[PDB]
């Protein structure tokens, strides 16, 4: 070995919108790079803000800056052991940050909080703390308080030591000064909350807190560390990364509250030879297992492959298994990306990050494991759009590309609705799809224009046994056209609520209409049926029975009969009871209790109607019959009300009549 596992920190800097992840990373590397002297993964060292701890290996992991890359973001949560979740003193708890925090709960990632940009206008640390408490549902525990509002930003009050921290230039050297009187009264209030939150860790500490009414600084970091790992609390810290004031203390909290590879549950994988689940404990003696997280490429050096080791040791020259595929790869040269240098390594132990230079087939999310003892370690779309090429000719090669892109990207979906002549491409973000279309426009050639999906409205009749006459007479191009038929139309069969799809055609003619012209009548009706009688939308189905009609042997032909049948079927616009229909979805909302009031009333803001309500762990499960039209942007509107906590499922349920405000505007469209 080299450095002991307990001295390792595999962390991720989770920051999204107005957080300043880019600055916070450059800073982390800067402070660590200097402090020590006295890319996808950045191997650094931290001895302490005031050199107070032992030398630790903090493995700064790149987390994605967009929630639309769900797979990349779910994986980064497995590559790290603990999270440094960055917020903006201003913005605070945004919808973007809510989603990562929810998937983090899914993997149970111990976290600490960084409330960056305390310098920017409208920034207040405690407001964000209430937002973390009230909207993120964990238990935030401030270990610091803030000095100065916006422009007034000097530093932090370390609530454990109870000495106000001011900064000295480049914000690495700090002044352990005193709490100013204005803050003295508040620091007490928050310190008591922290000491109490630390006290409820183990029974030992509660009896010591109950003795005096306090605990030692070491007994405070003990309690706060236990519940951090237990995923019961999030220690909070504030600062300004760009204005340098605060980044070393954050790195300390990483040392203090975040776990080492052993202090998290053993990565649960699957038996390669999948119906069985085996697992690997962060142990050198456990058979080797790791996952590849970033396949980068340097021009001179070659193809890098960022690999987080979970269990065992791997040395330059080893021959492993790519368990995903089945292929056996041989491990070549290895390195570890530092702040600026590329440091050449020989072996890589459990719970560490090394780069595999020049490798054969090693895809992202690939398990590299022990040949002898093997294991393999490694979603519903949110947004859907209507796609079509700029020039109608392209059409076949659009579906070739999209079909391939959906096979390349599993987080991307393609489906066609033929009755509406629509291709529906879907995924995780407006962004995700803007990128996919862009890739099709370039790397595939098919230029395509995207639009909001159109509602596939259908049509129906109500009046049964309606006998309509179709009379076609046109005198053109040196010929006569004669078509004459009477057809009796009955309404399409209904369940309960479900309408029977298709045309039910019958022949009730005594012999006035010839034998050979009859199929042309079916074709005419069918043609009209898909051309639409009311507002020009296909009819769901129809009962149609021809029974009368004269003919002129010379001027009468199949096409004249096709026309007269369509002429008759069109007249159902007045003589039929032409009801326009709309798709009705079988929706299911899983909401926590608070949000149930908002959600339930929003389903009614969508003409939706309640078909049952169960009681679950956190809240309600509401089953509802809601029109697809009113379902526009649900995944988002729902992630809004539930504060990113709810989930919804849907499927098509039936067809039902549409409202007059919709219908009348659909007939005015004609």
């Amino acid at each position: 070995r080299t450095t002991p596992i307990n001295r390792y920190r595999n962390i991720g800097i989770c920051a999204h919108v107005d957080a300043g992840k880019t600055t916070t990373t450059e800073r982390v590397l800067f402070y660590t790079g200097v402090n020590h002297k006295l890319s996808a993964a950045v191997t650094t060292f931290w001895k302490g803000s005031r050199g107070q701890y032992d030398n630790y290996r903090v493995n700064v992991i790149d987390t994605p800056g967009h929630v639309d890359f769900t797979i990349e973001v779910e994986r980064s949560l497995r590559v790290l052991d603990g999270a440094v979740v960055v917020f903006c003193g201003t913005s605070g708890v945004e919808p973007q940050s809510e989603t990562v925090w929810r998937q983090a709960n899914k993997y149970g990632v111990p976290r600490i909080v960084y409330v960056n940009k305390m310098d920017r206008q409208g920034a207040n640390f405690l407001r964000v703390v209430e937002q973390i408490k009230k909207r993120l549902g964990h238990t935030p525990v401030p270990v610091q308080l803030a000095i100065g509002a916006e422009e007034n930003f000097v530093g932090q009050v370390d609530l454990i030591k109870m000495k106000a921290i001011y900064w000295n230039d480049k914000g690495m050297t700090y002044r352990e000064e005193e709490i100013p009187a204005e803050l003295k009264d508040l620091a007490e209030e928050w310190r008591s909350s922290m000491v109490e939150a630390a006290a409820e860790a183990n029974e030992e500490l509660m009896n010591k807190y109950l003795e005096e009414g306090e605990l030692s600084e070491a007994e405070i970091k003990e309690g706060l560390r236990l519940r951090t790992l237990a995923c019961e609390i999030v220690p909070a810290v504030c600062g300004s990364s760009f204005k340098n004031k605060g980044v070393p203390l954050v790195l300390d909290a990483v040392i203090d509250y975040l776990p080492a590879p052993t202090e998290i549950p053993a990565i649960k994988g699957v038996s390669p030879d999948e119906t069985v689940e085996d697992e690997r404990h962060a142990d050198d003696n456990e058979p080797f297992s790791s996952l590849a997280f970033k396949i980068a490429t340097d021009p001179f050096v070659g193809t890098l492959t960022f690999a987080r080791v979970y269990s065992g040791v791997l040395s330059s020259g080893d021959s492993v298994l790519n368990s995903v595929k089945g292929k056996k790869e041989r491990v070549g040269r290895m390195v570890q990306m530092h702040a600026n240098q590329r440091e050449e390594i020989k072996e890589v132990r459990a719970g560490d990050i090394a780069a595999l230079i020049g490798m054969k087939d090693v895809t992202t999310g690939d398990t590299l494991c022990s040949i002898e003892k093997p294991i393999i370690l490694e979603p519903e779309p949110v947004i859907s759009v209507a796609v079509e090429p700029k020039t109608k000719a392209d059409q076949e090669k659009m579906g070739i590309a999209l079909g391939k892109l959906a096979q390349e990207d599993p987080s991307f979906r393609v489906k066609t609705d033929e009755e509406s002549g629509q291709t529906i491409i879907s995924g995780m973000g407006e962004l995700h799809l803007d990128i996919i279309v862009d890739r099709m426009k370039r790397e595939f050639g098919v230029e395509a224009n995207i639009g909001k999906p159109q509602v596939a409205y259908r049509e129906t009749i109500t009046k049964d046994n309606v006998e309509i006459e179709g009379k076609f007479v046109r005198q053109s191009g040196g010929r006569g056209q004669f078509g004459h038929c009477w057809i009796r139309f009955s309404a399409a069969d209904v369940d309960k609520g479900n309408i029977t799809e298709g045309l039910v055609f019958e022949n009730e003619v005594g012999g006035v209409v010839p034998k050979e012209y009859i199929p042309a009548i079916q074709k005419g009706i069918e043609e009209q049926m898909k051309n639409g009688v009311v507002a020009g939308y296909p009819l769901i189905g129809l009962k149609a029975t021809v029974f009368d009609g004269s003919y002129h042997d010379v001027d009468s032909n199949e096409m004249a009969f096709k026309i007269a049948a369509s002429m008759a079927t069109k007249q159902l616009a007045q003589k039929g009871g032409g009801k326009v229909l709309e798709p009705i979805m079988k929706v299911e909302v899983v909401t926590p209790e608070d949000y149930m009031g908002d959600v339930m009333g929003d389903l009614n803001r969508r003409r939706g109607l309640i078909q049952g309500m169960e009681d679950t762990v956190s809240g309600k499960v509401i089953r509802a019959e809601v029109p697809l039209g009113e379902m526009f942007g649900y995944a988002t509107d729902v992630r809004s009300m539930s504060q990113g906590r709810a989930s919804y499922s849907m499927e098509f349920s039936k067809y039902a009549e549409a409202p007059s405000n919709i219908v009348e505007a659909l007939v005015k469209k004609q």
Binding site: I424, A456, L628
Partner: peptide, 8 residues
């Protein structure tokens, strides 16, 4: 006509 499931 409206989502990933085609349906409608």
């Amino acid at each position: 006509x409206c989502w990933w499931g085609x349906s409608g």
